[PDB]
A paper describes a structure:
Yersinia outer protein M (YopM) is a major virulence factor of the three pathogenic Yersinia species, Y. pestis, Y. pseudotuberculosis and Y. enterocolitica. Together with up to six other effector proteins YopM is translocated into host cells by the bacterial type three secretion apparatusand significantly contributes to the Yersinia infection strategy. The individual LRRs in YopM consist of 20- or 22 amino acids and together form a LRR-domain, which makes up the central and largest part of the protein. YopM isoforms of all three pathogenic Yersinia species were found to associate with the serine/threonine kinases RSK1 (p90 ribosomal S6 kinase 1; MAPKAP-K1) and PKN2 (protein kinase N2; protein kinase C related kinase2/PRK2).
The YopM_34–481 construct essentially consists of the LRR region and the two N-terminal α-helices that initiate LRR folding. The asymmetric unit contains four molecules equivalent to two biological assemblies each represented by a dimer. Analysis of the interaction interfaces between the four YopM molecules indicated that two YopM molecules mutually interact by binding of the C-terminal LRR 20 (residues 461–481) of one molecule to the internal LRRs 14–17 (residues 342–422) of the other molecule. The total interface area comprises approximately 1010 Å2 and is mediated by 21 hydrogen bridges. Altogether these data indicate that a dimer represents the smallest biological assembly of YopM and that the dimer creates an interface that allows binding of one molecule of DDX3, thus forming a 2:1 YopM:DDX3 complex. It appears that the YopM dimer forms a binding interface for the DDX3 fragment. The first part of the binding interface covers an area of around 1000 Å2 and is formed by LRRs 7–9 of the first YopM molecule (green colored in Fig 3D). YopM's highly conserved unstructured C-terminal tail is not part of the previously published crystal structure or the novel crystal structure obtained in this work.
Author numbering:
A (entry chain A), B (entry chain C): 34 to 481
Amino acid sequence: KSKTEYYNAWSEWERNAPPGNGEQREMAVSRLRDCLDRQAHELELNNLGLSSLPELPPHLERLVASCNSLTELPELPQSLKSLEVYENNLKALPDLPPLLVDLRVFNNQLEELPELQNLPFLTEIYANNNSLKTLPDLPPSLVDLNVRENYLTALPELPQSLIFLDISDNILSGLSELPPNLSCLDASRNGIRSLCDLPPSLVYLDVRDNQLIELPALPSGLERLIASFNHLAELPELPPNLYYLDASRNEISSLCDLPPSLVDLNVRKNQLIELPALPPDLERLIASFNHLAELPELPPNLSYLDASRNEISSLCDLPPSLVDLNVRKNQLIELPALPPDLERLIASFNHLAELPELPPNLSYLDASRNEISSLCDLPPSLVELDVRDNQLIELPALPPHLERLIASLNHLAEVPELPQNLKQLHVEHNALREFPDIPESVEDLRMD
Amino acid sequence: KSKTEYYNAWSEWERNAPPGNGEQREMAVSRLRDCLDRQAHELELNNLGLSSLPELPPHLERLVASCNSLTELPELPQSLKSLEVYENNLKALPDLPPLLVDLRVFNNQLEELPELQNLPFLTEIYANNNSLKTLPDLPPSLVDLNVRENYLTALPELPQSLIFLDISDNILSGLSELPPNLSCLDASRNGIRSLCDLPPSLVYLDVRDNQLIELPALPSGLERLIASFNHLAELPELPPNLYYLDASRNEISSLCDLPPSLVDLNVRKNQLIELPALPPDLERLIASFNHLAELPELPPNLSYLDASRNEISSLCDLPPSLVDLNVRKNQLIELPALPPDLERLIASFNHLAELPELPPNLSYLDASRNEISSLCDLPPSLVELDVRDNQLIELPALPPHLERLIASLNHLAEVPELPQNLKQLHVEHNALREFPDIPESVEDLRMD
């Protein structure tokens, strides 16, 4: 086509929008002409509310037409190197030109993709969030593939060249093989029943929410493993570079040894009776919802500990690095000395008769559902106090920066003078002979 | 005298400003010279962190030097019409020039003000938040005075010309007779024991948090009255233009008639046994913490009602305009039909056996501490549900956009499948035969 032949086709397309609607076709034709006149490489038509596109200017390398309401596309020029048409209503794509490198077609209604095996320059496909039931055979040199949130039931052969692969939230039931250069795999939210070998190049592996009984041998290179919400009976041996492990909501009976590189562990909601020796550099331990009789000696750098919902009868020495401690629902009769930098303590649902001396940086304290007869002095740093369901007849003087006081289901005869910036006061089910004066600041009051 | 004499004084003042250097003196001398060179009216030196100012350019009308660390000021030029030096550390002011019109010296440590009676052009003084024990005699033509947050124990004579007056948060115990043009008075947070006469021109009156037994006659012009936190036994007759009344936290035994112009009423925390007939155009009624046996018929436009902490045994017809209803802590055995546009219902602490059909726009529901045996169907609009302390054995299907579920202290045998974006689940003290699966989303969990 000559130059004025395009000008006609585009001015004709400009009228096929009915007079008075949301489409900025006049702005689009302005850009189409500017692009043709200057032989520009890029053409961006995004956020103009288009239902269709006219014949595209040839000799362009990049077409961005995302965030519109397109139903299909016109044939693509042969010079085209990248295509960005995400956030549209595309049910299918045209045939793709040979020089193509990027394909971004996520957030559409694509039911199929065109033939991909003959686009050797195509290195990135983001076709996530579509209605794809199946993938055609992939390009030779594909580096990045994202096809999450689709209805895939099986996978084609994956290239040697492949590095990043997201196939999560599909209907996969197995993975036959992975390429040797894959460094990052997300296969969450499928129905996968078994993995085959993992390549040594792998460093991030996320298989959350599948139906595994066991994992294959893990690469020594592997750094982060997420294997939550499966039916794991045990973990395989863990590599020496693994620093983050989440194996929660499985049926693990016992852990193998943990490497010294491990800094973050989560084995919540399993069948553990005991933990093995924790590594020195561990900073975050979650071991809730298990059957723990006791914890092993805690490492010097541990800063967050959640050992709730267990049957721990005795709590060992707490390291000074600890800042967040939760031991709700255990068999505790006493807590040990609380470390100075502690900020949040949750020791509810045990058999405590009293609390240790509270450290001076404690901002949140929940010691409800114990048999506590009186409260030790409260630090001024305290903002939230929950001591419902205990054996209290009186509360100590309340710190001035307290915002929430919950002390219902006790035997309180009176409440102390209330802080002037208290937000919440819950003292139902008590023996109050006199009700306190309520600050203007309290917005959520329950009493008597 | 001359131009280069100022240039010297300012370059001398520029050296020096230790601890070198929290002060932008070089930027300030730049503006001082630009101001002198161009004979400009304004000079702004705010947010430059100055500890002092040098000799000012004469022939300027406006000096803005707020948000600095000034301890005193240089003598002010005679041409000066306005002064803005708030947010500083001024302990005193210089003598003020005759042509002055605005004085903004709030947020300082001023212990006294200079002689004001001889500045006839001075029409606005904002000297609030200082350490003033006393005011000098005021200008003849003063229109606006703000001296809130000071240590005043008495007031000088107020001009005829005075319109707006804020004297709140001081140590006043009585009021020096008010001028006849005053349209707006705030005398909150003093120890005022008695008001004398209010001028007819008055339209806004705020005497919150004083020690009044009664109010003088109110002007017919009066539109908004705040008289909270006093010892009022009764209100005087209310004028026909009054649209906002807050008489909460007093000792009122009964209300007089309410004018039809009244749109917002608050008589919380009084000694009321009944309310009088509500006006048709009322939109907001707060009558909490009283001894109400029943409410009168509610007007068609009432949108917010808080009649909590009373002894109401029967609740009359609720108008469709109602959106926010709170009847916590009364003698209710049943609720009437809930209007369609209702969004928040709080009916906790009554004797309810069941709830009416919940309207479809209800987002927050608290029906705790009743004797409810089963819950009617919950609308999908519901985000927060509190039904603790009731006679429930099961919960209905939970709407999908529920974020908080509190159903502790019941007889629940099981909980329904939980919404996937639930934040809080509190179901302690129940009969759960099996515990539900906990979504990843729930961050605050309490259960048996």
